[model samples]
Target: EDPLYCQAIGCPTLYSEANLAVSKECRDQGKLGDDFHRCCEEQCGSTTPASA
Candidate 1:
């Protein structure tokens, strides 16, 4: 597996195509891999941290 896995298998519908598409654009332009993970975590991974 890549050091960074954008979307895991059967991870559920955490992000829609639109969300992944935009995040891909950002990451493609810069070192924003975390951006995608962060988005996924926020929407699915965790339910503790408040939106900032």
Candidate 2:
């Protein structure tokens, strides 16, 4: 919710929808790690989905 927080974490450029979507997709494709998941959540405001 806060751009300040995202910037504090060095995610100033990760604030775009495309960037966030690619990051999320990478995780789904087993390319990204848990660390990115945390950053993505903070920058994108979307929780990483878990298998149901």
Candidate 3:
């Protein structure tokens, strides 16, 4: 992840397309490698927190 982008408020992961859906809590705890997965159906196409 780019250092600047990673530090941004609603920045998404730079891992893979698969990790695109990881939860905020999971990412915060740095459990992304194991917990990364597609986004829940509820959050698809949703706006970023900064925009929401």
TM-score of 1: 0.31
Mind giving the per-residue lDDT tens digits that candidate 3 earns over 1-52?
A: 6321122234444454434444443455444453323332233333557754
lDDT of 2 at 13: 52
Q: In lDDT terms, how accurate is model 2? A: 0.46
Clashing pairs in 3: none
Stretches of candidate 1 off by over 4 Å are 1-14, 32-52
1-52: candidate 2 lDDT, tens digit per residue: 3222122233335566556554554345444345555655555543478897
Candidate 3 TM-score, true structure as reference:
0.21
lDDT for 43 in candidate 1 is 49
lDDT of each: 0.46, 0.46, 0.38
After superposition of all CA atoms, the RMSD between model 2 and the true structure is 11.4
lDDT of 1 by residue, 1-52 (tens): 4433346333333255544543454346446445656554444332476697
Candidate 3 residues lying further than 4 Å off, grouped into runs, are: 1-22, 37-52
